[PDB]
Design a protein around this ligand. Structure first.
Ligand SMILES: Nc1ncnc2c1ncn2[C@@H]1O[C@H](COP(=O)(O)OP(=O)(O)OP(=O)(O)O)[C@@H](O)[C@H]1O
Ligand SMILES: Nc1ncnc2c1ncn2[C@@H]1O[C@H](COP(=O)(O)OP(=O)(O)OP(=O)(O)O)[C@@H](O)[C@H]1O
Ligand SMILES: Nc1ncnc2c1ncn2[C@@H]1O[C@H](COP(=O)(O)OP(=O)(O)OP(=O)(O)O)[C@@H](O)[C@H]1O
Ligand SMILES: Nc1ncnc2c1ncn2[C@@H]1O[C@H](COP(=O)(O)OP(=O)(O)OP(=O)(O)O)[C@@H](O)[C@H]1O
Ligand SMILES: [Mg+2]
Ligand SMILES: [Mg+2]
Ligand SMILES: [Mg+2]
Ligand SMILES: [Mg+2]
Lengths: 752, 449, 172
């Protein structure tokens, strides 16, 4: 249905592009059976449909090596048609070819340099003498000879555009040589093939702009008018302006560009004059496309706007789009970042009827984007874009381009010892050897961060799972929670159940909640957003809920993502307990959080994790399943857990073999992990003191401490203290036992 | 322009977007625009003496028109072009579809009945989308890149009732376009228990739109206000989602605090705007999730804070009184803290009907457990009734998380078996009893006594 | 040869006094390319459409002379978040800048630099890859870094022998 327009349907006339081993610039060779199917004779001029609205005519030839589904074309033909190897183009004989009455040909400015003889007699005179070579306007053909072979472009071919060169034809090279940068820019043109992902959106745009122009007879027959308005809205970097550029490059109809703020002028009423001139100029050339970049710049809400001129401009846009005199085959496209900021009357059927949602690509989409981007660049053999696509979690498509650029820069960094910056030129062997490798992509991935999350970036202490001692069950639960919905969605669809997306950590201070959060941030394969407790709150009325909504929206954009609240009890507390708190600002914030986690909006892959010291004061509506689905209790470590903690802290620090951590873990009862870390730090400080004293003694005698020993740990344990009192443990156990009594059965069993 | 009207009599002057040149002079910050307004007033005061010239003006927002232009003697007669009704929509479809190549299977009465708030431009959008889909059907025969089209395809082109059904599925009113959010697909059979509540909601949504004549006969106004209060996780938002999905009435869903803005006067403007766009698409359902955020006991903000929330609640009360009984606007509010709600909004005439969603009972828990697993394969040896008996005070969300924990355990077992297989090289088609065992061990009651 | 476009965006952010404007001066003096200075407050004007005209004129002047470097000093003042700002002219200027950096017609050889004390004030659209490719953090110097700064500063000074710059670097 919708995807059908992107399908080629494997038409017999369309054929595979293949290399031309022997065919010259002006001829093509195909299989003789293909002539049999196409009813073509040798020497017939054939018109080849090419991308970016480029067409070239060549002399057909019979070749056995050319495959039936393939066509052999020289590099010149591919350049003129803007077609790459392996693409699919059709062949059609040129209709009613007339011999060229006159030809104007222009060289390229880079090749003409160093050519001692004049180009016409050296290149044009022998090449075109009895050539009988078909050419096209805008085609560049390479001519051998001279100190460098010269590419020649026939800017004007007469008769336009169907012609054959003959010896009697007048040949001149007068005029400025065609700029090589112009040639590259004509090569660097974006087409519909360039857009990656969002295939359905591209199909809808093709139906909007390409179908009416190609086949107006269909809509004339049915007696309907095709849509005349397209709004492309989405987060920054999805590719709206890229689609606009592709449509501009590959539509025969006229293209008119309007930048939003560019309309504004100092004189009174001059903006309306500019808009009227733009629309009238579009109407002058009948089938035309108007692209209004940044529509939200010139079309704010009329009720919201406080400026008179802006309201008059939006009214002028409304009247131009719809009025007494309706438009005559004029398509208006606008790309906006904020679709809600547009005036409501503009979003009606008359003016902007079709809204196209350019959204965040999924994994296969960003794989396709990576393939399209990396087709041009040089790559090694070990590169594997599937892994890179899997790693790039929340990236949008501009971020993928950033990743490619960073990897290329790293690759060039690697060859810096051979290269000299001061040198004017680099050795050709270096550029031949220089290429992108998988190491470059891995390093760029390490450096890469989504553009949406750039504001919420926090440096993390680089903790790994092995640094946390104990809590093995909690570690496995966290890894399963973050992994299963992402890596294995098919299982959940098979069982037809949505995953759980909430975890709350509650326990005595120093037990390992923020440590687990650091481990998840460093290790797990999902974007991490860290929110301190009260940083969302703001003086102004209604700003706090705006911040909460904005941060949840950022989490949804970068899905899969993890949202961590370090101190949940600060931001979410039992409602109605505030004598002040502004105009119930705390309660409104809590309500906003409640509606964000579990609301009528469809659930997306965002996991909310919270850590709290007092879980009792937390509002009951938060703890209801569907918000903070699972409550995990982080207890004081046991003797085995204490052994694991003491091992984990001391792995990097050199410690004497006689020191037995099991005895420390045996006596230390009720100590938190923080207390054990403090004991180890005190032992380290005592060792530092001893080493410094020995160094001072050596300096004095001028006028040791290889590892921490048993006496250091003895003194540290003398200084050690038990952080968490018994009563706090009692209140946490009271909360836990209330929950367990709510469970009501330590053991459960089905009757059999 | 007025002189040219005088030159050729009779003359008609049409002013399109009158609000563009006729804003309230006090709201205007420029002298030239004020002079334009006064000049319009003076030219039309002179118009009063003239013989054969009549001026008509069209505006989207009548309020923005300067009050003098609405004064007696100025635009004395004012026509409200209301949204079309069902017969009006059918007439619009008949007018617009006479040109199109409609098939015989299409009947326009069903299409007219299906749409709720379409104002006529949406009907043209519906027809154009259906024609586009019809093109897509024949678009496999003849491709875009093909330069010509078979005449047989041209004859074969037709608009079927399937295309209109597709367009109706895709259709959305223009007013709702600003306030559309994706809602998970929920039906009534998906919800477990609360059969009486389902019936009541269906009746209150269906009766005024379907049968106003009965209420007119018996002389009672329909009750437009419904309040949901109950323990968290009992299914208020689920009922709202089901209403949004199946009901043949437009749905506007707004979070509580999202209306408030820092700028002076913007919050009341947002309240008026949301109620206006609710009235425009009647019959429409207006849902205030987390009502306790907006509506709070009066004087608390006045005592502490700015006090603009008081103006917000006053504006909501003023608007919710303002709408007429004939207008088909229904207001649903869900809160889990009914005590903190301002008692003024509970007063009869506003949100007069109250519904208490209880913590589910025994058979209700059985129904909930069945509903959660209607799509999930489960071994027959598992007895849901026993879970219902054992889980006395559990809410619906607790039963759901027990089922989801069982699913997670099944997934863990399947994954470990798979990785064992790949390790050997180089299970659980349905959830069993032991998964539910471990889920019940992890289970806990969400709502305290 | 590698097949990628060079990065065209630089953002320098750090606490005041770290040396961002000094880096801009060094780049302007040390490179063989056109340099155009843009100060955030100076572009905007009370007239309607004058600020947009100033931005377009500056980018066009940079476009004419290639390669070009544009340094936008105090970008935070000129480019606030569009959601937060209420003034219409500021939104128009931000949108014009967004279009100028990356639009349907893209800059060929213009490399744009900016210095700001608070990077978070900048609009999230500008921080995208296409507009400002990478953000460079000019941070608090370390002990060795500030020793290096002291050596650079005191080169032009006349010093006596007793001056010990390592001690001064340690104390500060
Ligand atoms: N789908 C895509 N396929 C290929 N490249 C893409 C795609 N999406 C984005 N890009 C790349 O990202 C950039 C496109 O950014 P673009 O100008 O389209 O953004 P935008 O949506 O207009 O942003 P803004 O909101 O700032 O207006 C280019 O560098 C392009 O190569
Ligand atoms: N299981 C553990 N393994 C290793 N170190 C641990 C462990 N538990 C705690 N620590 C130590 O505790 C310190 C960090 O404590 P953490 O941030 O986890 O506290 P918390 O219990 O979340 O408390 P708070 O509520 O105060 O944030 C570090 O010194 C860390 O080494
Ligand atoms: N009757 C029910 N049938 C099926 N599922 C239910 C039922 N009641 C609750 N649930 C489950 O619980 C969740 C629905 O909770 P809902 O949003 O309706 O709660 P609420 O009453 O609005 O509470 P809150 O005060 O937390 O907003 C879903 O996960 C749904 O599967
Ligand atoms: N790294 C450095 N090395 C040498 N001198 C420095 C360095 N950083 C700063 N200075 C000196 O301090 C002066 C002030 O620094 P500069 O004006 O560059 O700061 P800035 O970060 O741009 O400040 P602002 O926030 O005011 O724009 C410089 O002109 C220079 O003399
Ligand atoms: Mg853009
Ligand atoms: Mg913490
Ligand atoms: Mg709810
Ligand atoms: Mg400075």
């Amino acid at each position: 249905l919708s995807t059908a327009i992107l399908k080629q349907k494997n038409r017999p006339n369309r054929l595979i592009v293949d290399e031309a081993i022997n065919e010259d610039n002006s001829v093509v060779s195909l299989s003789q059976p293909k002539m049999d199917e196409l009813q073509l004779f040798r020497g017939d001029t054939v018109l080849l449909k090419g991308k970016k609205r480029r067409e070239a005519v060549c002399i057909v030839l019979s070749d056995d090596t050319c495959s039936d589904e393939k066509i052999r074309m020289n590099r010149v033909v591919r350049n003129n048609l803007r077609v790459r190897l392996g693409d699919v183009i059709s062949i059609q004989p040129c209709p009613d070819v007339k011999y060229g009455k006159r030809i104007h040909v222009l060289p390229i400015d880079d090749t003409v340099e160093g050519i001692t003889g004049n180009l016409f007699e050296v290149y044009l005179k022998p090449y075109f003498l009895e050539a009988y070579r078909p050419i096209r306007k805008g085609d560049i053909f390479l001519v051998r000879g001279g100190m460098r072979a010269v590419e020649f472009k026939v800017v004007e071919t007469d008769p336009s555009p169907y012609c054959i060169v003959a010896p009697d034809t007048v040949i001149h090279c007068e005029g400025e040589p065609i700029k090589r940068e112009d040639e590259e820019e004509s090569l660097n043109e974006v087409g519909y093939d360039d857009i990656g992902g969002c295939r359905k959106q591209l199909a809808q745009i093709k139906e909007m702009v390409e179908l009416p122009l190609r086949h107006p007879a269909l809509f004339k027959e049915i007696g309907v008018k095709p849509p005349r308005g397209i709004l492309l809205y989405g987060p920054p970097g999805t590719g709206k302006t890229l689609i606009a550029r592709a449509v501009a490059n590959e539509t025969g109809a006229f293209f008119f560009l309007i930048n939003g703020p560019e309309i504004m002028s100092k004189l009174a009423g001059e903006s309306e004059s500019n808009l009227r001139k733009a629309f009238e100029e579009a109407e002058k050339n009948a089938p035309a496309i108007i692209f209004i970049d940044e529509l939200d710049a010139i079309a704010p809400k009329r009720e919201k706007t406080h400026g008179e001129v802006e309201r008059r401009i939006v009214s002028q846009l409304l009247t131009l789009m719809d009025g007494l005199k309706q438009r005559a085959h004029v398509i208006v496209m606008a790309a906006t970042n904020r679709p809600n900021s547009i005036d409501p009357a503009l979003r009606r059927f008359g003016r902007f009827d079709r809204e196209v949602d350019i959204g965040i690509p999924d994994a296969t989409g960003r794989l396709e984007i990576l393939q399209i981007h990396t087709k041009n660049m040089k790559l090694a053999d070990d590169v594997d874009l599937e892994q890179v696509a899997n790693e790039t979690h929340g990236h949008v498509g501009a971020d993928l381009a950033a990743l490619c650029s960073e990897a290329a820069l790293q690759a060039i960094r690697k060859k810096m010892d051979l290269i000299d910056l001061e040198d004017e030129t680099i050795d050709a062997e270096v550029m031949n050897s220089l290429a992108v490798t998988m190491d470059d992509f891995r390093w760029a991935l390490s450096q890469s961060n989504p553009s949406a999350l750039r504001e919420t970036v926090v440096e993390v202490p680089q903790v790994t799972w092995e640094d946390i001692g104990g809590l093995e069950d909690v570690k496995r639960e966290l890894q399963e929670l973050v992994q299963y919905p992402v890596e294995h969605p098919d299982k959940f669809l098979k069982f037809g159940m949505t995953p759980s997306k909430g975890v709350l950590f509650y326990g005595p201070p120093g037990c390992g909640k923020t440590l687990l959060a650091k481990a998840i941030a460093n290790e797990c394969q999902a974007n991490f957003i860290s929110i301190k407790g009260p940083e969302l709150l703001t003086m102004w009325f209604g700003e706090s809920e705006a911040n909460v909504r904005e941060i949840f929206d950022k989490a949804r954009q970068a899905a899969p993502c993890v949202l961590f609240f370090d101190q949940l009890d600060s931001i979410a507390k039992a409602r109605g307990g505030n004598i002040g708190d502004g105009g119930g600002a705390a309660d409104r914030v809590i309500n906003q959080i409640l509606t964000e986690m579990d609301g009528m909006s469809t659930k997306k892959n965002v996991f909310i994790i919270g850590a709290t010291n007092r879980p009792d004061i937390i509002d009951p509506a938060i703890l209801r399943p569907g918000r903070l689905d699972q409550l995990i209790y982080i207890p004081l470590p046991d003797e085995k857990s204490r052994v694991a903690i003491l091992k984990a802290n001391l792995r990097k620090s050199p410690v004497a073999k006689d020191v037995d951590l099991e005895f420390l873990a045996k006596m230390t009862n009720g100590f938190s992990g923080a207390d054990l870390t403090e004991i180890c730090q005190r032992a380290c400080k005592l060792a530092i003191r001893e080493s410094i004293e020995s160094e001072i003694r050596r300096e004095r005698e001028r006028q040791p401490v290889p590892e921490i020993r048993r006496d250091h740990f003895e003194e540290a344990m003398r200084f050690a203290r038990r952080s968490v009192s018994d009563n706090d443990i009692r209140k946490y156990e009271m909360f836990a036992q209330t929950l367990q009594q709510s469970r009501g059965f330590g053991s459960f069993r089905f009757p059999s």
